[model samples]
Target: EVETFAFQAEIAQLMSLIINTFYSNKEIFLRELISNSSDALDKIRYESLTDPSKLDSGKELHINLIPNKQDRTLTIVDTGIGMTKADLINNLGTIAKSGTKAFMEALQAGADISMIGQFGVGFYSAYLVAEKVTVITKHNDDEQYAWESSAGGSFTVRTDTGEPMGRGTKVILHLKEDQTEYLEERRIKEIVKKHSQFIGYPITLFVEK
Candidate 1:
């Protein structure tokens, strides 16, 4: 079942501000994405300690970057606790009050730019470089689902019946004209080393020989 929903008034306004004013550099999209992926992997690991059944026993924790130059796409994949349909709506549709308000105010005040991801809106940073973004995720407790948005005021969610992910998330970014540099292998490696080298999980960059 596919459904379309409007973004909350505040969330919509924040997205508009993020794409137009908040982040000056486009490359940081990879950084924010990897950070989120790392967090997702951490969540699954923590859950496994309390209940072994909650973990995807078949998959190891890792982050993968796949770039397609011809398609102008960059995909960030993670073997982690993926989201259910409802989770997608809540997490992406509505921003936490504290994280949303503080981040917006700080940006307005010209506060330190490096502090951007302190709030949950780090996911929205993808719009800095992407004209559209698609999230394909599967959780052990739920079936796979696809969430898509153009960084506009609304988004769509639908059940995905394709081959299952087994367990994890795939964030596919449709790069904008000015942001295609992210499709290059060297550029991706540089950004990963620069921003995500300290992430606890292994990060792999896929490229042809």
Candidate 2:
């Protein structure tokens, strides 16, 4: 049930490039992740129009921010368009390829690869604050899957035998020692307010006392 795969060629170099480029403004990592959740929520909602079966019964679309101070982890949860095993691999895996190749081309040929071009790959920016990331996802058309990576040369994906996830994805970030700032509820609210206030889905924050 477990399979490991190396990222596309040059992924190691790409990781360092992104780390170095965004090292100064690491907070944008939250913005990118929240935007991703919004995108997922939108996709599922749109698809449900034609195929109402895609909508999981009794579950309203939403996003949640939760932090565990003792574990030093921050989880972004969403009941949106989740991913199957293949989706997890291709969608997550090819992001590294697409971003890296385009970025490499832009750097070598001075092509106009704008900042927007980098948005899709911002998932990699989780490394800016997290030492490791665990993603548990379930899609309507496929079984659940869990994907884990340390921003290393490779990642692991497996059938999620025990995730309580219902119909979406949960991204749990094992925060770096210095990134404890993200564990605070107030700070998370501010980040969402700053970057995703316009997002239509109801985003909730858990108060861990």
Candidate 3:
């Protein structure tokens, strides 16, 4: 059954305010993604411990990066349980339902989740930098799909064109000119080690010489 989900208008306003004015570090975006990827891999591994068949496809969990200087694109790929179409739309598109409102309420109510763990809103932070973002994902339960957006207007969704490397996800950030600093090898490695050192899977950067 296709259920409906909605968010409070105030939550959206709060998100807009934070992304527009509060966030100061771009490096945090990479950390957020890596951390989320680690969590996804951990989930899959925990599931596979009893149900060996869960590893029938999306087994290996790792992170890979490809920085294309010719086009100035930084691509981050992950081998983990990818999102279904509904997961894509609901998680990425719709307002605030990724639990930010609840997090804020909890914080206000004196239950701080942040003191132990970060919340889920960090994925949306990518929009703060990339003019265009493309996410290619495939899940064991659904067909591969591509989600593309510019954050200025509506995002487009379509079935993927090429085969996904088994079953996982890859996101390519067609970076803007001013954000070219992310393409540097030293910066990329430094950011990864700083934030993802304790990640469940290995993170690698594949640079073209």
lDDT, candidates in the order shown: 0.82, 0.79, 0.70
Candidate 2's C-alpha runs over 4 A off are: 20-22, 91-95, 104-119
Candidate 1, which segments miss by more than 4 Å at Cα? 93-95, 112-114
Lowest-sum lDDT 10-residue window in model 1: 91-100
Candidate 2 per-residue C-alpha lDDT over 1-209 given as tens digits, one digit per residue, 9 for 90 to 100: 68999876667776666656534667778877887888888888999989888785425899898999999999999988888788787746346566677777776676332342363666766888888999999888788788998876788998888846778889999999988999988888888888788888888899987
**Higher-lDDT candidate of 1 and 2:** 1
lDDT of 3 by residue, 15-123 (tens): 4543465444667767766776676677677778899887888556788888898988888888777778987776543344545766566666775322212555666
Residue 68, model 1: lDDT of: 88
The candidate scoring highest on lDDT is 1
Error of 1 at 97 (Å): 4.0
List the candidate 3 regions with Cα displacement exceeding 4 Å. 1-19, 92-95, 102-117
What TM-score goes with each of the models?
A: 0.92, 0.88, 0.81
Q: Which of 2 and 3 is ahead in TM-score?
A: 2
Q: After superposition, how far is residue 7 of candidate 2 from its true place, in Å?
A: 0.7
For TM-score, the strongest prediction is 1
lDDT over C-alpha atoms for residue 57 of model 2: 40
lDDT for 23 in candidate 3 is 43
